[PDB]
């Protein structure tokens, strides 16, 4: 299943990925020259894309569709910055749009105190409830706990 | 030092099915068959300790029923370049451990695309001890 | 003996799910062929190719790595992005042996940009 791991380099992403998926990590940059790494879990056969999203690539990161199923978006939690506005809106309506055949799991990374705001005036202002829509979760992470990790998983190996 | 000005993979019968300019200055791809027509088929079935086309070194190995070329300027040593000339023919010989036809070529096409990038790469001859080569490809 | 058109399109069968190395390696070397008796070249094709190429990255077939190279290698002058590849590229590097490297280095030279190139003069220095 090809379920795309976003974010940027920078990240940590690559961090947690490596983490789970090999046990261990990696630095806190997400991926210059990408990931496509497959994972059997629940002996289910799957491939990761994880990309340090970094921008011209990141114009481009739609760059790909085929096969296309299903969402890590990793999104890191404490991020104060970059996560709202026009920019996370843009990006998950194009998204969601351009590939209305994928469920879509956003994973809310180093929340460790969380240095954010408010867990709910975020999940609202990316219309969580916008929801009437394909299956979904919020999910709470600071990368060193996996705060949430497993279920994720779990959860998507539903069916 | 860019010797190959151009390698090419020959029939008998007068024809190339395989050449790597190493560096063009007559364009296309046509131009060169036409060079070829001229002088492979004048040459063909008959090869020469020197060969010459003005100013400009011609080398190369045969079969009997393939041809072997490569292009260089002739203005510069015999023997290296022989040995070079030799060094693939052998390689190639000793690897293949038989004598290329056209069926050598069919037989198995994806040898000399491999081949041909091995030793030299475009025009200068990274690679080589055939033998070696040979050992130290298989995969 | 065989033609181009039908190929090209064809060649993204191994881009489809399809799991038989070697109908692909030869699909490749026909391609290959194509281009090697002469063959008109583009972006287009190129960049559905760059999607197309690109996902097919979990094998660890040696072999199989070796015939990437050639390909991208026939990119150069006239070649399409390298960030995807960054990271490939250094899979090569890290790569075990030695051979991976080579290859890599011998496409990315006609075509690359100045920047990155800091980057890469460690992996020269080593």
Redesign the interface.
């Known amino acids: 299943m090809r379920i795309l791991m976003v974010g940027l380099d920078g990240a940590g992403k690559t961090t947690v990925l490596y983490k789970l998926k090999l046990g261990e990590v990696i630095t806190t940059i997400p991926t210059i020259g990408f990931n496509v790494e497959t994972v059997q879990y629940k002996n289910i056969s799957f491939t990761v894309w994880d990309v340090g999203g970094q921008d011209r690539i990141r114009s481009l990161w739609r760059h790909y569709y085929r096969n296309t199923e299903g969402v890590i978006f990793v999104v890191d939690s404490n991020d104060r910055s970059r996560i709202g506005e026009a920019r996370e809106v843009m990006q998950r309506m194009l998204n969601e749009d351009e590939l209305r055949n994928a469920a879509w799991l956003v994973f809310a990374n180093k929340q460790d105190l969380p240095e954010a705001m408010s867990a709910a005036e975020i999940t609202e202002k990316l219309g969580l409830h916008s929801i009437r829509n394909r299956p979904w979760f919020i999910q709470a992470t600071c990368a060193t706990s996996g705060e949430g990790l497993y279920e994720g998983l779990e959860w998507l190996s539903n069916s | 030092l860019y010797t190959v000005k151009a390698i090419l993979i020959l029939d008998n019968d007068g024809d190339r099915?395989?050449?790597?300019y190493y560096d063009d200055t007559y364009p296309?791809?046509?131009e060169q068959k036409a060079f070829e027509k001229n002088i492979f088929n004048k040459t063909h079935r008959t090869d020469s300790e020197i060969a010459l086309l003005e100013g400009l070194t011609v080398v190369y190995k045969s079969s009997i029923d393939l041809y072997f070329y490569v292009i260089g300027s002739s203005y510069e040593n015999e023997l290296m370049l022989m040995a070079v000339l030799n060094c693939l023919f052998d390689s190639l010989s000793q690897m293949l451990r038989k004598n290329v036809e056209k069926r050598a070529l069919l037989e198995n096409?994806?040898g000399l695309?491999?081949a041909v990038?091995e030793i030299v790469?475009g025009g200068v001859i990274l690679e080589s001890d055939p033998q070696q080569v040979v050992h130290r490809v298989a995969? | 003996h065989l033609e181009k058109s039908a190929v090209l399109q064809e060649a993204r069968v191994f881009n489809e799910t399809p799991i038989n190395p070697r109908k692909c390696a030869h699909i490749l070397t026909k391609i290959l062929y194509l281009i090697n008796q002469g063959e008109h070249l583009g972006t287009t094709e190129a960049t559905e190719a760059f999607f197309a190429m690109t996902k097919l990255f979990q094998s660890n077939d040696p072999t199989l790595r070796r015939m990437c190279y050639l390909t991208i290698k026939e990119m150069s002058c006239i070649a399409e992005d390298v960030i995807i590849v960054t990271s490939s590229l250094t899979k090569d590097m890290t790569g075990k042996e030695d051979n991976y490297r080579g290859p890599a280095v011998r496409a990315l030279c006609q075509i690359t940009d100045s920047t990155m190139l800091q980057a890469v003069e460690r992996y020269m220095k080593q």
């Open positions: 099915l395989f050449a790597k296309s791809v046509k096409m994806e695309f491999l990038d790469d995969l």
